[PDB]
Amino acid sequence: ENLYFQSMSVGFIGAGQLAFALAKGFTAAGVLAAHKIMASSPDMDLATVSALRKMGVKLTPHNKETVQHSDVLFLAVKPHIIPFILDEIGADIEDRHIVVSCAAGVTISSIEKKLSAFRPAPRVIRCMTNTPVVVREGATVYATGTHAQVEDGRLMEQLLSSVGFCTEVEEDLIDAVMGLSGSGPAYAFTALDALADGGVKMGLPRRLAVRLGAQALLGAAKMLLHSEQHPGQLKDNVSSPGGATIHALHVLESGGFRSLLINAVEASCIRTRELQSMAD
Amino acid sequence: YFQSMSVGFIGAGQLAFALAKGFTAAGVLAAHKIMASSPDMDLATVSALRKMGVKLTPHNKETVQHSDVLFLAVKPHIIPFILDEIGADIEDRHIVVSCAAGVTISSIEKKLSAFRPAPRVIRCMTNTPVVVREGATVYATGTHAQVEDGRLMEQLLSSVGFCTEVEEDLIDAVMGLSGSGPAYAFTALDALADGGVKMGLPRRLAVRLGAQALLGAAKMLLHSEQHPGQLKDNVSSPGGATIHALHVLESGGFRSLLINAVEASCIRTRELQSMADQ
Amino acid sequence: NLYFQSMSVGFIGAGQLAFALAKGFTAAGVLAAHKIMASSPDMDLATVSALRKMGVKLTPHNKETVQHSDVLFLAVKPHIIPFILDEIGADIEDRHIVVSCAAGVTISSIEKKLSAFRPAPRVIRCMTNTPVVVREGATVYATGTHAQVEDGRLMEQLLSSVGFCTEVEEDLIDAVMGLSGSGPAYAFTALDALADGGVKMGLPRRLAVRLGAQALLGAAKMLLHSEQHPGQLKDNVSSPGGATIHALHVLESGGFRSLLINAVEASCIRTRELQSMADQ
Amino acid sequence: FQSMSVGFIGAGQLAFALAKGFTAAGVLAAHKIMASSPDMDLATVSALRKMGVKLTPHNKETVQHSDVLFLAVKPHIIPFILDEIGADIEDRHIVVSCAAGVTISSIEKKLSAFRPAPRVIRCMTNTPVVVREGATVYATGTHAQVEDGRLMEQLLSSVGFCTEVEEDLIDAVMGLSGSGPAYAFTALDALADGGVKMGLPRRLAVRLGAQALLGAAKMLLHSEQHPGQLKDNVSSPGGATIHALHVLESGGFRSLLINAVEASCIRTRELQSMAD
């Protein structure tokens, strides 16, 4: 790791929520010192830029400055901004750069087409991560581009593994991963807010209900990750005949609880596709 | 490390295994200092506890004589039969910790006080993730529990997850939230994985990613001073895929279903204990 | 202590919005009613009679409004704007700032029409709402190609006298219309229903309307003056096991949140589908 | 210049909201307010302390300090409180119960066992007193003087709207304006989500949505028009607003808000039937 990271500099095009989250996770993991990170944004009036600055992250309005001072370049902007970014800094991408795109629905092919008009063989990697990298429990996948070298995938695997789970996938899976684990934390925060409301309805202080609900979800998720058993079998171990849990599971089933979560993953994926067809 | 402490389990099922596995993984109890009892010595939970090093026996009275801290880990309608069987063996030294859903401290103390006054009783509400040391536990102290008794139980149960003392009248609501909560989460994880599979992910990857997302979000909330709505705002980029997905959850009344669940579990727990009383 | 001593304001159209702005501007003291002119082909409209009682100068002839005015508000229905611009385009001078309040109408479409008569028309696009009438409006504006920096600063100063006002990129304006432009109608519907609920439970209608409106006003003010998330302020009202958390559950059971999201989306979509029909 | 001493039994969300509102209005000095709680570790207690409010664990000290004594505890706590401090209520006291559902009759019954003629007023208010835009009603008890009702109207009018009602309206007011801020906070969160879905930054969507609701509410308070007529003035034919109003109607939006007021009122009544 020392060899990969000792003198590596990282740049963020964009200084929003994902840039802050990855920067916080990388520095908390100890892989990167905050001053070796640079972020650029046209609007300095954001709370994320303030948090990055108090972290010690170097800030600039000029994306070309971030490009000049970076080895690994994360594109942390909305999908529709990507092709305008590539036109802007494309003349500055050099052999040394690894361009890591975080946007969903922006293909490696389209990024490589843009950058290859300036210099052949751009090294491009697509990444799909989520905000819990900020506590080093992210869920990350990546796909390597046509010109990515052998050490490039291995470097990205080690970098993103320091802030959570990380595995290589074929590029065609990435938009579906966005619908599941990219959007997933928002599903979990909605559920935790509602579970806490349920606790409050039944008499619990709100502070206690939030803590218990979150701890229950965290523990159940860890249980599944550590067990070889199917989620339904773990559910069965918790639901005793005639008991409180099986009564509660019935009212979840009666509202189509499962189908709402399937609807959510699908809706996220569908939206990513229609954004992509607006560009393409 | 409580080295001088002998722990017993009346009942050798899912909860006894989860606690004993958690305790020994935390290093607070040695497996050989734990005894568990069940009338069926060929149960699969019994086998798992045996492979752990726990001492096992079919005689509930043997577990009582071995133990200082005695966990009641039987189903709720068995608690009265158990208290009658061993009540004469309860000694001054014993702390009786009932894990049974719905069973009140009053009903345990009344049954045991017929044999010996001032039984030391603690009521505990925990959940199965103690097995990976990420449980959510609350406890209430009884009439005759000393102060050190509550501090002792909090030390023990803090080693396998979050633990805090509550007034007893909150415990049925806690059961509806964190006691049944793992089952809500396993249902949600199965469904999120089906959604990933529908959109083209391999099942095994979808289960791993869905569970990791839920774990990471829960950890984010536990480590943050922010409202869960504010953390949700940070995922939801304007016009983006996430806010579109959240709309379809809202259109189905997702929030209300989870409130329904906590309510139903809490209400059933009260219903059952009303039948026990009368 | 703001007052525009050398500014003549004109309104093409003398309907709800012209009345609301003229009343807000005059109550703010930043304009005398006699320095305001409004035109409409219906001199027997109820809004025209109100403007006349304020002191506002009225005329049936749009050309007279243009000749009197420095700042010219286009306060007609969107499908009337192109006929307006053809009628008075030859009367636009260098001194004019043209401020379109019409829902959906793009700066591009206005500039194209006026530029046929005289190059470099100074155009600002504004999205406001009817509570400017009580000086609590919510307004955004976007500046056109030829609007000078002082033009936007001036309009911000003027529109800030009747409520909140900030500059936005033009492509946000249709979404603002769906939120704060249509928003007062959502609130009037909500206040009618809340009053019905109060009456069902035994309150006199006049009291229920007063309390419902006061509750909404107070809650909105709390949020504006707080750095807290609206979910956290809700938690402070929702005592465990109490009346409020029981009532919140029945709102959630009906999908209350999703209905308000549906509304904002439906307003914004309809605006875009109208402007597409106009552009084709 | 009345130099009133005010006490709160309970130092939670409503006690903080009222203390903040009263001191911001200038009617009370913070250090002339005393609040008591057995849990001296809440966020509300820390905020009261920072305001300069006097804090004590002992309800008797609050009673002895106060001229006007607010009962700002949960409804099921009120009879425990009246048993504890009933012997300390004096003829000079005005006892103002804020508790949802607790009747004047039950309060006077408890306190009359100690001194005859306890002066009792029941009030129903809401958290926006914190920004002096509260919605408050009050009802006077058997022994409250006419001056006692005038004083309470003067005091509560300093932090928002205030009017006297017959007591049998108070539980319905709770369902409308007492719980009402929670309905608005829910609506504002959802409207902001809708703004974000259509491409607005969250910070701007929150601000525009709240300003929209504030302005519309103020319009209705300053107008003699029916809310349906104000709605008609925003709704041009074929336009964006009337399309959005239709999707609200299709989901039964109106009935959800009626359901909420009713559910709050029913819960209040069923809690009181438990205590009784």
Ligand SMILES: NC(=O)C1=CN([C@@H]2O[C@H](COP(=O)(O)OP(=O)(O)OC[C@H]3O[C@@H](n4cnc5c(N)ncnc54)[C@H](O)[C@@H]3O)[C@@H](O)[C@H]2O)C=CC1
């Ligand atoms: N936030 C999340 O939960 C996750 C986000 N993503 C993706 O990551 C990307 C970034 O999302 P967020 O950080 O949430 O968004 P954001 O809106 O918080 O941040 C975007 C940033 O880009 C900046 N920006 C805009 N135009 C720019 C330009 N031309 N040059 C430089 N900077 C520019 C903005 O000023 C802002 O600082 C998006 O594609 C999103 O879909 C993917 C996974 C999770």
Ligand SMILES: NC(=O)C1=CN([C@@H]2O[C@H](COP(=O)(O)OP(=O)(O)OC[C@H]3O[C@@H](n4cnc5c(N)ncnc54)[C@H](O)[C@@H]3O)[C@@H](O)[C@H]2O)C=CC1
């Ligand atoms: N499993 C869970 O998710 C949680 C369980 N609990 C409570 O823990 C208690 C035990 O639950 P589980 O372990 O899931 O049950 P289980 O059904 O898995 O195990 C119960 C055990 O009691 C034994 N048993 C039955 N009759 C007995 C008797 N007369 N003497 C001794 N042992 C006897 C059975 O053989 C079995 O080993 C219940 O009261 C439940 O409410 C509490 C919170 C969560």
Ligand SMILES: NC(=O)C1=CN([C@@H]2O[C@H](COP(=O)(O)OP(=O)(O)OC[C@H]3O[C@@H](n4cnc5c(N)ncnc54)[C@H](O)[C@@H]3O)[C@@H](O)[C@H]2O)C=CC1
């Ligand atoms: N009313 C609202 O809630 C808001 C309205 N707007 C926009 O403001 C514009 C005007 O809306 P309102 O005042 O509500 O409409 P309105 O229907 O109340 O008034 C329209 C006025 O235009 C006049 N008019 C028609 N043809 C004309 C012509 N050829 N020359 C001059 N005047 C003519 C009519 O006589 C009438 O006085 C619309 O484009 C609407 O989208 C924007 C935001 C809020």
Ligand SMILES: NC(=O)C1=CN([C@@H]2O[C@H](COP(=O)(O)OP(=O)(O)OC[C@H]3O[C@@H](n4cnc5c(N)ncnc54)[C@H](O)[C@@H]3O)[C@@H](O)[C@H]2O)C=CC1
């Ligand atoms: N919070 C709101 O939005 C409104 C609340 N109310 C009513 O106001 C009352 C108080 O509500 P909140 O302040 O929101 O509740 P809360 O739970 O925030 O405050 C209750 C306070 O009472 C204290 N307390 C508990 N037992 C006590 C005792 N024996 N002696 C003294 N203090 C004790 C608690 O420590 C806490 O400080 C309730 O009856 C509620 O129905 C009425 C309308 C609006």
